[PDB]
UniProtKB/Swiss-Prot annotation, chain A:
It comes from Thermococcus kodakarensis (strain ATCC BAA-918 / JCM 12380 / KOD1) (Pyrococcus kodakaraensis (strain KOD1)). GO terms for molecular function: rRNA binding; structural constituent of ribosome. This is Small ribosomal subunit protein uS13. Located at the top of the head of the 30S subunit, it contacts several helices of the 16S rRNA. In the 70S ribosome it contacts the 23S rRNA (bridge B1a) and protein L5 of the 50S subunit (bridge B1b), connecting the 2 subunits; these bridges are implicated in subunit movement. Belongs to the universal ribosomal protein uS13 family. The lineage of its organism: Archaea, Methanobacteriati, Methanobacteriota, Thermococci, Thermococcales. GO terms for biological process: translation. The gene is rps13. One of its GO terms (cellular component) is cytosol.
Curated annotation (Swiss-Prot), chain C:
SUPFAM superfamilies: Ribosomal protein S10. This is Small ribosomal subunit protein uS10. It comes from Thermococcus kodakarensis (strain ATCC BAA-918 / JCM 12380 / KOD1). InterPro entries: Ribosomal_uS10 (IPR001848), Ribosomal_uS10_CS (IPR018268), Ribosomal_uS10_dom (IPR027486), Ribosomal_uS10_dom_sf (IPR036838), Ribosomal_uS10_euk/arc (IPR005729). Involved in the binding of tRNA to the ribosomes. Gene3D superfamilies: Ribosomal protein S10 domain (3.30.70.600). The gene is rps10. Pfam families: Ribosomal_S10 (PF00338).
Curated annotation (Swiss-Prot), chain D:
GO terms for molecular function: RNA binding; structural constituent of ribosome. This is Small ribosomal subunit protein eS19. The gene is rps19e. The keyword Ribonucleoprotein applies. GO terms for biological process: ribosomal small subunit assembly; translation. HAMAP family: Ribosomal_eS19. It holds the Pfam family Ribosomal_S19e. Part of the 30S ribosomal subunit.
Curated annotation (Swiss-Prot), chain G:
PANTHER family: RIBOSOMAL PROTEIN S7. The keyword Ribosomal protein applies. The keyword Magnesium does not apply. Keywords: Ribonucleoprotein, Ribosomal protein, RNA-binding, rRNA-binding. Belongs to the universal ribosomal protein uS7 family. Gene3D superfamilies: Ribosomal protein S7 domain (1.10.455.10). One of the primary rRNA binding proteins, it binds directly to 16S rRNA where it nucleates assembly of the head domain of the 30S subunit. Is located at the subunit interface close to the decoding center. This is Small ribosomal subunit protein uS7. Part of the 30S ribosomal subunit. The lineage of its organism: Archaea, Methanobacteriati, Methanobacteriota, Thermococci, Thermococcales. The gene is rps7. One of its GO terms (molecular function) is rRNA binding.
RNA sequence: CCCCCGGGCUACACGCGCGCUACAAUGGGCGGGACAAUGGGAUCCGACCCCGAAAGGGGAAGGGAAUCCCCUAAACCCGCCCUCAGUUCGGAUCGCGGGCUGCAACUCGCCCGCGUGAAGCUGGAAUCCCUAGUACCCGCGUGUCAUCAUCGCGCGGCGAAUACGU
């Protein structure tokens, strides 16, 4: 009845653990957002994963797909007010990295201070670099 | 009759009242038997155990404490209670027993803080910054 | 009717003077008084640095100004008010009076 | 027999178990998606924390009434792990406390004095003393020195 | 096809300011709400006079805190860096940024060797 | 010509206050209404009525 | 979870912590007899008194002494067990609540295992960890010797208790084992003469060096 | 000389001083129980009520200081989860978003919410501070202040070890 490795979208997790910590292994999903997902799904976050039916897996992934439609609040989401769509939306794993890269690249394209700092490999948020930031 | 009494400890004052009764002892509206923690409960109960049974079974005591931490409050309360018990019973036997056990029961402590000095004012008067050479 | 007098000063002697004066003027006449009542003392402290430059260890200078306060109620009888307002108060004391 | 004669944590558990049979006390929409304070990081690990919150608020109103929504905000605060910066005490938020007090009023357990905190009604004062008498009748079997009170 | 939160340049160009300010982040929203200052209004007047005819000369200003609006697209503005007037040719992707993020002040540091 | 010689008014910052006695800018005591720098207070304090007492 | 009958304890007589007797105890070491306080009490807490008086270390209860030696933060500027044990925020410094609880659980385990009185066990441990000899450097004609010198009954106790608490602090550093359990193990070993005791080890080491330098 | 308008003192291959935060169980998290003192307050402190998930916003009693406010402090106790692991330790660094103070926040400001998750597993030679309500540990006003405290001067809470010498 019990499994040792469950496979949520793309990523695999540890069934010996609780679900809120096992889902923490998908980049883009923390403990808080995992708790929210499980609550909107109807699952105790204290049960050892592995006792996770394909029923529940499918429900979780459909949730993750469109969270603001299932009632996940718009403020508790990764990417609100996307540049070209509005449409407060959420991104995990393979989509996420590309968004980071595209943001930094559009900062680089208009020749901005932040993009130049990203290029050179230096700080961006106003820190002082004389005594620290040693490689 | 009624006997009122007081007790002190660092930034803490306790006022106690004693009379005839059943054996109840309240410290600031809650009974002593359920004071927390135990290290502060034994401190207050010590004199009531020393005095005995036929003495406390026939007195009702009350205490109101204000200021300075749970340990300060408990000690001030023990002091007040002991003074009131002695004033109410008039037993030099009890007096000598209490003073053998611990004399601060009736002769309270007389220690406050010491002001601070200007090298590390937050830490204290005698802690100082670290030198380099 | 009652009247309440508040006194403040950096000197205790002026305060004692005024207190004795009004106490005696109220006693020689028939008027029930109140006080004198001491309120807590107000201390203005200022800790500064001695050196006008940076060099040297830090030695600090703590100045203090203590201010003593008193309160009285006098019952504001017929002539008491007019005979009390006729007082010779030094100019290092702040006296105010309020009718309740 | 009275609230001042029993321990608070036990009393709050025994009161929150009963607060549920009362229907005017229900969690709102945003309860699962919310953190109980700026001074916190992770969400409550229980599904029935709202009722413990409202029981505690009931009893604090009882004790320290009239009390409004700043003293309870302070009593429901704590020190925040700020990272490399050192720790400081911070206050909680003012929607949970307010909705709790409103629901208690809807159930008729508290009333607001016009300009002075908020207080308990007689039935609100009956509830707790009843539960405390029960819990004391229970504890007197283990703490045989609790009878005289 | 460039899109700013779902709308195109032709639509942003007809949207008013209280409309176009709910599309910006909080800081630019606050700036526009509080109001433009004399020098900013002056620069805007110059930009409008220029994009239709009259002003044939180039735009220059010390105003490094002006926000790039849509009507400011297609024009080159010379902004101060402290020493000279750097020309920024504003592109559709600059909307919503300050005018000093593109005119830098310090020069990149290429180190040497330390002494004692 | 008379305009380009004298200051813009300052309601806050550091150039808003100035010592009554000498005219300094940075270090100024503001405690209880005083407006002296840390230097002039140490000289005029025993006149104002302060004591050591420590 | 502790039961209520233990969370709310009320003593009925004058016994150490209200639980354990102190009159059935005994001592056969006359050098230490008069420095081990075995007065019938309940709460062993002296709020700093008996400290500025030179010989005030003789009117304090061994249990309170052990408690104040348990209020530790590892070892700083020297090394024990082969490591610096620096904690700096996670240490029970000025927490007699926690120290009291530790010693309580320790004596509990001792009574549970040995079937004897934990205070008598502790007395035998202190005996068998009391060093009778040490070294020093004396000078004549301007050179430094190394002599063996007798130790006094007031310093023997200090070293014994310190070493017991150090062994406890050591057996618990970054291991699944707890402070109370390690303290209980240390005391049992010191009493039963098992080399697993840091304390017995140190005693024999000291006496060995001293007999050598004799 | 005296004013304004923009930049810089915040630039960074590195060497040092003083400190903060940690490298776990003498603990991390969630929920509930407690207990202070010093000081300060006019376009200033703002209780009480109402909006907002939070940061924060709109009304507004009282107060010119034993009258009202800032103020139910933290470490501590109880119950559940984690059980010696680069982890439920650690919390830097980056992205999207929301707001305050201000004539003006890119250069170069503080605060919030969701994500990302870097070195660090107790430290060589050497070296510093401390004798009683003292040191260690815990948090709090105030000074600067239109906003901004890992600092200075003070306040209390818990509370030892060793020597009475050379
Ligand atoms: Zn001056």
């Amino acid at each position: 009845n019990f499994r040792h490795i469950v496979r949520v979208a793309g990523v695999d997790i540890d069934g010996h653990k609780q679900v809120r910590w096992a889902l923490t292994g998908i980049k883009g999903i923390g403990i808080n957002f995992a708790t929210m997902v499980l609550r909107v799904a109807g699952i105790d976050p204290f049960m050892k994963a592995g006792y996770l039916t394909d029923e529940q897996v499918k429900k979780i992934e459909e949730i993750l797909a469109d969270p603001v439609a299932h009632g996940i609040p718009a403020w508790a989401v990764n990417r609100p007010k996307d540049y070209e769509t509005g449409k407060d939306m959420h991104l995990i794993t393979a989509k996420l990295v590309m968004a980071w890269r595209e943001d930094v690249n559009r900062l680089r394209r208009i020749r901005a201070y932040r993009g130049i700092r990203h290029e050179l490999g230096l700080p961006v948020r106003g820190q002082r670099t004389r005594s620290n930031f040693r490689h | 009759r009624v006997i009122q009494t007081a007790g002190k400890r660092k930034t803490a004052v306790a006022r106690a009242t004693i009379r005839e009764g059943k054996g109840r002892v309240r410290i600031n509206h809650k009974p002593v038997e359920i004071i927390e923690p135990e290290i502060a409960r034994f401190t207050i109960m010590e004199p009531l155990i020393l005095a005995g049974e036929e003495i406390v079974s026939r007195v009702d005591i009350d205490v109101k404490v204000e200021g300075g931490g749970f340990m300060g409050q408990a000690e001030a309360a023990r002091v007040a209670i002991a003074r009131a018990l002695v004033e109410w019973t008039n037993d030099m036997n009890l007096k000598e027993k209490f003073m053998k056990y611990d004399r601060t029961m009736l002769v309270g402590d007389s220690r406050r803080t010491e002001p601070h000095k200007p090298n590390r004012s937050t830490k204290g008067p005698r802690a100082k910054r670290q030198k380099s050479y | 009717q009652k009247a309440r007098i508040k006194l403040a000063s950096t000197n205790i002697k002026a305060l004692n003077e005024v207190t004795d004066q009004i106490k005696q003027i109220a006693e020689r006449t028939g008027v029930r008084m109140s006080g004198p009542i001491p309120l807590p003392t107000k201390r203005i402290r200022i800790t500064t640095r001695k050196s006008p430059d940076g060099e040297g260890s830090a030695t600090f200078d703590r100045f203090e100004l203590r201010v003593h306060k008193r309160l009285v109620d006098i019952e504001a009888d017929e002539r008491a008010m007019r005979q009390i307002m006729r007082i010779r108060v030094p100019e290092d004391v702040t006296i105010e009076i309020e009718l309740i | 027999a009275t609230v001042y004669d029993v321990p608070g944590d036990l009393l709050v558990e025994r009161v929150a178990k009963a607060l549920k049979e009362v229907p005017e006390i229900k969690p709102p929409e945003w309860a699962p998606f919310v953190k109980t304070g700026r001074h916190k990081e992770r969400l409550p690990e229980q599904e029935d924390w709202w009722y413990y919150r409202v029981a505690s608020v009931f009893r604090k109103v009882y004790i320290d009434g009239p009390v409004g929504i700043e003293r309870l905000r302070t009593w429901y605060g704590g020190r925040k792990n700020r990272g490399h910066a050192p720790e400081h005490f911070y206050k909680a938020g003012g929607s949970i406390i307010r909705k709790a007090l409103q629901q208690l009023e809807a159930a008729g357990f508290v009333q607001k004095v016009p300009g002075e905190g908020r207080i308990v009604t007689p039935k609100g004062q009956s509830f707790l003393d009843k539960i405390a008498t029960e819990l004391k009748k229970e504890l007197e079997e283990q703490i045989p020195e609790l009878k005289k009170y | 096809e460039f899109r700013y939160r779902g709308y195109t340049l032709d639509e942003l160009l007809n949207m008013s300011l209280e409309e176009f300010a709910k599309l910006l982040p909080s800081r630019q929203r606050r700036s526009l709400k509080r109001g433009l200052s004399p020098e900013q209004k002056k620069l805007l007047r110059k930009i409008r006079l220029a994009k239709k005819g009259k002003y044939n000369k180039p735009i220059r200003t010390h105003s490094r805190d002006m926000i790039v609006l849509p009507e400011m697209v297609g024009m080159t503005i010379h902004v101060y860096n402290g020493k000279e007037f750097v020309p920024v040719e504003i592109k559709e992707e600059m909307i919503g940024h300050y005018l000093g993020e593109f005119a830098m002040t310090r020069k990149v540091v290429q180190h040497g060797s330390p002494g004692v | 010509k008379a305009d380009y010689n004298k200051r813009k008014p300052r309601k806050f910052g550091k150039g808003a206050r100035r010592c009554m006695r000498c005219g300094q800018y940075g270090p100024i005591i503001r405690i209880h209404g005083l407006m002296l720098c840390r230097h002039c207070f140490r000289e005029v304090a025993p006149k104002l009525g302060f004591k050591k007492y420590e | 979870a502790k039961p209520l009958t233990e969370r709310f304890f009320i003593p009925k007589e004058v016994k150490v912590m209200g639980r354990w007797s102190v009159e059935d105890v005994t001592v056969e070491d006359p050098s230490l007899k008069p420095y081990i306080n075995l007065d019938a009490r309940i709460l062993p807490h002296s709020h700093g008194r008996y400290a500025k008086k030179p010989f005030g270390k003789a009117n304090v209860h061994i249990v309170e002494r052990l408690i104040n030696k348990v209020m530790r933060s590892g070892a700083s500027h020297y090394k024990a067990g082969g490591h610096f044990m620096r904690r700096e925020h996670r240490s029970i410094m000025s927490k007699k609540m926690k120290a009291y609880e530790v010693v309580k659980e320790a004596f509990m385990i001792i009574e549970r295992r040995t079937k004897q009185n934990p205070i008598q066990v502790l007395v035998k441990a202190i005996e068998n960890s009391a060093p009778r000899e040490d070294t020093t450097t004396i000078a004549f004609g301007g050179i430094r010797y190394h002599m063996s010198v007798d130790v006094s009954p007031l310093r023997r106790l200090d070293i014994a208790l310190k070493n017991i608490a150090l062994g406890a602090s050591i057996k618990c550093y970054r291991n699944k084992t707890t402070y109370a359990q390690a303290l209980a193990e240390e005391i049992i070993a010191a009493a039963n003469k098992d080399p697993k005791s840091f304390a017995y080890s140190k005693k024999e080491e000291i006496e060995r060096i001293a007999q050598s330098s004799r």
